[PDB]
Symmetry: D2
Subunit: 114 residues, 4 copies
């Protein structure tokens, strides 16, 4: 699996479970095609989110529904959504992990690329 996520909750010190997300692929005319959806497990991960065949070189957008997460936690969040947008070059079996650390009024995101 070439695309992994890891979401953490900075208030509770746990992974962020049951966060919905959407993966979209940029098209030649600059629009977006949705190619996958998923919900994190209790470890803040989505196993087998997409296949290598579904992940050619191109720009991708991962939309995390953080507002619903915080609302369900009982906190009022600032952000309507958290989007991560990046150009992927998966040649050579290159894999991407998107890490996201959530607080109600902040988030940190980073990427680990191997």
């Amino acid at each position: 699996c070439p695309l992994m996520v890891k979401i953490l909750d900075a208030v509770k010190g746990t992974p962020a479970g049951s966060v919905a997300l959407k993966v979209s692929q940029k098209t030649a005319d600059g629009g977006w095609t949705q190619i996958a959806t998923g919900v994190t497990d209790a470890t803040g991960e989505i196993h087998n989110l997409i296949t290598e065949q579904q992940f050619p070189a191109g720009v991708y957008r991962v939309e995390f529904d953080t507002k619903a997460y915080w609302t369900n936690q009982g906190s009022t969040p600032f952000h309507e959504v958290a989007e991560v947008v990046f150009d992927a070059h998966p040649e050579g079996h290159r894999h991407y992990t998107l890490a996201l650390l959530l607080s109600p009024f902040s988030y940190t995101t980073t990427a680990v690329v191997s």
Copy 2:
């Protein structure tokens, strides 16, 4: 000024100068329309980005062109853009500061709401 930004560079320990951004407003039909552009000064700020009259209650998107910033620093960035999306004045009019801390493969966003 009801909407302020503050962008810092975590590689250099300075504000991030000359970062381009675009402000869009969510439309009634669920789309977006661009209402302002700007470029940070050497303190990482944009004075008079929009007026209070341009900033009524509703959802806004600020698109920060972090890829161009890092390219112009001679670094290779991960993200195509950094987007911050939020509902403004949902319980009354306030002032918003969007803070953004940039590294080539990571960013931290937070908001200070008056």
Copy 3:
């Protein structure tokens, strides 16, 4: 002032008010001497934390009492304290802003250094 702090609360989206801190200087023998204490105002800052006379080149430690901040906010925090340790004026005199973004189980710190 040559050493400024800015503390923000990532749960509430406000500055972190009434955070206590201590500034110390590393001694020739490897110990620490306290040179200042302070408590942030409602903007998350401490005006006139130290003077230039108190800030010769060397290693300094700023200890932020984040555990008491969260305990008073009514949250249960992870860290006992948050410490920022840096060599000041290594290549000549500079001014320093230490920014700190607090959550109960996380913090981010960065520095803005200018000539």
Copy 4:
């Protein structure tokens, strides 16, 4: 394995390998006893840093040598060290992961605590 670390490099998008760190345990007299030292592997982790037997309830300090990490990357860093200080098993045994995201002038640190 009750204490794990995970260090990432925010400039390169890789784990931070070969980071030296020290683990100290606070003593009743308010001092610190060093109980372990380690170096991260190429995944930014240290396997078998300490045993459950070495990790009773109490306050611990993990000192990460971030300055040497950046100095060897050829970068110029701000912080002299990054220290993480926390009270362990305050309400019963848990497992602790200390995560650290490094940039030359910033770091973010969070904890994941199991049950």
